[PDB]
Write an enzyme that holds these catalytic residues in place. Structure first.
Site: not given
Ligand SMILES: [Zn+2]
Length: 372
Positions: A92, A270, A308, A310, A313, A339
């Site tokens: 930025d 972002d 999910c 990830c 999870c 997550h």
């Molecule tokens: Zn997850």
């Protein structure tokens, strides 16, 4: 391999999906960029950020100039080497956070003078100093330094701020171009201003196009105008920007905001929301956010989200995370953040895939129906 190359592979209405090739890597768009404030994406190792699917992260220029310092980072080898992230990094300009976190800000045509909010006052920030710091950090996508207009803003106020910002965009461009190493390996994005006035936005878009940038950001939004106004401003503003260059909506990140912004032509996003809310105990799911601290999750064996993919999870339950966050354990912040970032990256992948398949409009519709 190139310094910068944006290719649109598919389109649906105003929405588009493609890629940006840079020396440090390929960025799939629409893209979400996790925010790294003080040379770190809160509570996550760089490998974990990459593991969630991120192709690029955002570096904070105001923060880094104060601690540990732009010059020091450069001496140490640059931001990539310093934090352990070898893919592209967008920095930025620092202008926004100066006006939001600095003490006794002093606006002038030359730039802004301010007091560091923590130890004396690492003081001056102009278009050229901003570009300089961004060079020192070694960012891949450099943002031009601007003057953000607060919300609300009167037409004259928004005009004068936009006019200054366009003057600063030219200075930013020249400063960037004088540094050959930077001009040859990095990209420079210009930032449209103009508040919620389309005549101003149009003027800003034209000036920006006249100067010429690698990508164009839509600034001044997500500053209190609400999703309706935001979307209304996006409707006329995005078509003003060059179609063949990426469109970056700064600081926008609620899942629903991103989906509506992509429908309006936005390619990059972002926001601190996923990381921030993670520390706070809010987890994003396809059925809306949940606050893990709530008693009803005390013995819930199901993962944060049932679809999910990830690591969190796949390995831990809501019950455990609920415990960690209520106990104030660091692992709670780590797990929740991983997550949430994973959730955002998956949302971007679903957006990119549905656009390539010509079913984004249905996806958006289905997404909102279930999320709310
Ligand atoms: Zn997850």
């Amino acid at each position: 391999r190139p310094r910068f190359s944006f290719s649109i592979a598919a389109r649906e209405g105003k929405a588009r999906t493609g890629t940006i090739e840079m020396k440090r890597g390929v960025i799939r768009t629409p893209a979400f960029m996790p925010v790294g404030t003080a040379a770190t994406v809160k509570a996550l190792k760089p490998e974990t950020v990459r593991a969630t699917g991120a192709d690029i992260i955002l570096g904070n220029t105001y923060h880094l100039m104060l601690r540990p310092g732009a010059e020091r980072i450069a001496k140490l080898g640059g931001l990539h080497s310093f934090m352990g992230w070898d893919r592209p990094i967008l920095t930025d300009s620092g202008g926004y956070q100066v006006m939001s976190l600095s003490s006794l800000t002093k606006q002038s045509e030359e730039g802004v003078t301010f007091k560091s909010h923590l130890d004396g006052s690492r003081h001056m920030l102009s278009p050229e100093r901003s570009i300089e710091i961004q060079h020192l950090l070694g960012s891949d996508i450099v943002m031009a330094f601007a003057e953000c207009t607060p919300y609300p803003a009167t037409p004259s106020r928004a005009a004068s701020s936009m006019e200054r910002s366009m003057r600063w965009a030219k200075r930013s461009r020249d400063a960037f171009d004088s540094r050959k190493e930077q001009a040859e390996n990095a990209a420079l994005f210009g930032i449209q201003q103009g508040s919620v006035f389309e005549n101003l936005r149009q003027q800003s878009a034209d000036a920006l196009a006249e100067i010429g940038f690698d990508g164009y950001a839509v600034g001044g939004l997500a500053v209190g105008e609400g999703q309706d106004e935001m979307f209304r401003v996006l409707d006329f503003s995005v078509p003003m920007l060059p179609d063949d260059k990426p469109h970056y909506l700064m600081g926008v990140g609620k899942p629903d905001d991103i989906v509506g912004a992509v429908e309006r032509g936005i390619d990059m996003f972002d926001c601190v929301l996923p990381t921030r809310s993670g520390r706070n105990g809010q987890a994003f799911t396809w059925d809306g956010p949940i606050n893990i601290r709530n008693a009803r999750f005390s013995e819930d064996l199901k993962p944060l989200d049932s679809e999910c993919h990830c690591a969190v999870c796949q390995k831990w339950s809501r019950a455990y995370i609920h415990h960690l966050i209520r106990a104030g354990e660091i692992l709670g912040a780590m797990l929740m953040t991983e997550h949430n970032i994973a959730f955002y990256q998956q949302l971007m992948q679903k957006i990119r895939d549905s656009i390539s398949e010509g079913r984004f409009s249905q996806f958006a519709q289905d997404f909102r129906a279930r999320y709310f």
